[PDB]
Amino acid sequence: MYSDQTYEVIKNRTLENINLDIYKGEGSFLNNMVSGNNLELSKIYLELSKMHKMAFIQDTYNQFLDKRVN
Amino acid sequence: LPKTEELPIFREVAWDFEKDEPILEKGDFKIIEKKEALKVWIYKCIKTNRYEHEIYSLEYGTELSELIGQKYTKGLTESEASRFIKEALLINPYILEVNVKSANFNRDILSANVKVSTIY
Amino acid sequence: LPKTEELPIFREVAWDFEKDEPILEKGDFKIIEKKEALKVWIYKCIKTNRYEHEIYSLEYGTELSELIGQKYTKGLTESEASRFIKEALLINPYILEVNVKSANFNRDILSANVKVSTIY
Amino acid sequence: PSINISFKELATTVKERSARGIIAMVLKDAKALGLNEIHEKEDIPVDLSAENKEYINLALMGNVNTPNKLLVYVIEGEADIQTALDFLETKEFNYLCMPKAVEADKTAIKNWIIKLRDIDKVKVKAVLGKVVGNHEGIINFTTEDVLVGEKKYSVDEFTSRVAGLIAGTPLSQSVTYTKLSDVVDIPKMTKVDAESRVNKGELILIKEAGAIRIARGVNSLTELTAEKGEMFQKIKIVDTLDIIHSDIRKVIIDDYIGKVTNSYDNKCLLIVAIKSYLEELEKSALIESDSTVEIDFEAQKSYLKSKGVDLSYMTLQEIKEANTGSKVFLKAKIKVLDAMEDIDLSIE
Amino acid sequence: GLPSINISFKELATTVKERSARGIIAMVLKDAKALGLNEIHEKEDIPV
């Protein structure tokens, strides 16, 4: 799940997704190109994880509880 | 009993090391084979330190830029930089060993001779 | 395993050792820090013997004044006075070691060179 | 009838320090109007203003070490330059900075500094914001719109800060590529623009190696003559040369004038002392381990020509043996061992 | 004059006697713009 989803795991996943003539190695141009976007996707995964907590009725903030009680 | 499996040829983009900009052959990046990929890898590793950029893995990077700016005398930093290059370059499985010959003192520009041993 | 705790700076009154009278800075005794308190302590210890004054502790005091008055020849009393100074000065926890170089024979005035090792 | 034991302690220092780490601070305030030498940190007079306190705080810290001595003088802004010059003449200094130095004031300061260095033989340095002068003793820091700690800073404020930082910079270390953690926000500049600015002889800040650092430590002097060379374009060389000059002048004034007479044996003793001082410098990495001290033989030739003694029919050693008339002529071979800020090696 | 100590500090630059210049090029050619010699010593500088 979200805890499993991290930069390295999705990096390996995307490297497996891409099959191409040039060899894949550390420090490659495509390696960095994919790695930056995968760091972005890790941030997105953290945001999606926080979506669960902020969506719940429990452990809400001032504005969340205000909307719910309104 | 089984013999070690040979490392497959490392293929990736190519460019002139002096140009420092990627080159395109009729839209295709130049193919690198045999003793073409390792030079690019060493150039990439030496050129930029990992500790500056969070994206790169911790094992990557070199600390030669710490000596940049004259933080210590040359006499011992010659061997220190030799050791730094050895640490930075032997991480690659393709490379076997790295040798540093000497350093030349002249004005503010330091010139050193370093050797690379390869498999192919 | 824990390292030894450093001795805090010894603070007390100050004065000129040649004046032998306490000095006051705008009503405040001069502050002694680092290598200022140990000189005062050594001066106080050497200047007066304990056995003359009942108030002082038995460990305090020096017996150099016994040699005053020519009670024995100089040849051996040189080493005897070196030992007396070593006994009188190494009692202080601050002081590490005391070294005596030599003694100069001239008329009725004996001059000797003695060394002090400190922590700060 | 009483001779007492009177013992006075003696301390020996292998390294002797003279005219180093001095900061000259002059500010225009109508309240203090006096000189204040600060040897202990967080020592702030109540008279000084908030901006002057900020200047002091900037001067407080250094890159490696706190500056050894901070000297501050206060007087009204009117006729400030004359009194500042008089006070700096009264008490020696190593570096100078002015919060409100106008272009005319900066030019006058540079003229006074170069006059001192060229006639009074007093090696002094000054840090100035925007000066195009033709001397290497002055420091020109042309970096506009500088902000430190999300706070707007004037050019002179950061010049004073950099001077204080350099005062704490050890001689083994080089000011090149020294990063500043306090500086956080700076206007974006291109690499080409920064390189062009540095090639103009200006000191600027660059964002490199994940930090904000200065690109180089060259002198403010754009035009170095043929004799001066590349090394004289660096403040690091001139700093150690000035320190050696000051130490030699100080020891000469302390010992040889008046107290010592002129003789061949006196000349040999002076040569031995100079060689010992050069060896002490050689102990530090500042200068090369190899140096020579010699009598200026051609100066002796010229002195004989002034006297008129014929050069023929005696040994050349007799020229050295001949009295110089209350004078000494010397020659020394030295080389500055200031190491390398940048490197460029080859592979195979 | 008053006799006073005067310590001189000079920089050693290796001085070698220079002979007649060699390898110079005398470029002369006609144009109608900015008449006069150009003395182009710096590399790759074409005046307008």
Author numbering:
A (entry chain o): 1 to 70
B (entry chain l), C (entry chain J): 16 to 135
D (entry chain h): 6 to 353
E (entry chain b): 4 to 51
Question: Which lines from the publication concern this structure?
Answer:
Captured in one pre-contraction and two post-contraction states, each structure fashions six proteins in the bacteria-targeting baseplate, two proteins in the energy-storing trunk, and a collar linking the sheath with the membrane-penetrating tube. Since the sheath and the tube are anchored together at the opposite end by the collar, collapsing the sheath pushes the tube through the baseplate, driving it to puncture the cell wall and underlying cytoplasmic membrane.
CryoEM data processing of the post-contraction diffocin particles resolved two different substates, an apparent transitional state and a final state, which is 2 nm shorter in length. Using the same strategy, we determined the cryoEM structures of the collar, trunk, and baseplate in the transitional and final states at 3.6–6.1 Å resolution. The baseplate wedges in the transitional and final states are almost identical, with both presenting a post-contraction conformation. By comparing them to the pre-contraction baseplate wedge, we observed repositioning of the dimerization domains of Tri2A and Tri2B, along with a twist of the trifurcation unit relative to the core bundle; the dimer interface between neighboring triplexes is, however, preserved. Although the conformational change in the diffocin baseplate wedge is less dramatic than in R-type pyocin, where the iris ring breaks apart after contraction, it is still sufficient to initiate the contraction and release the bound hydrolase domain of the hub-hydrolase.
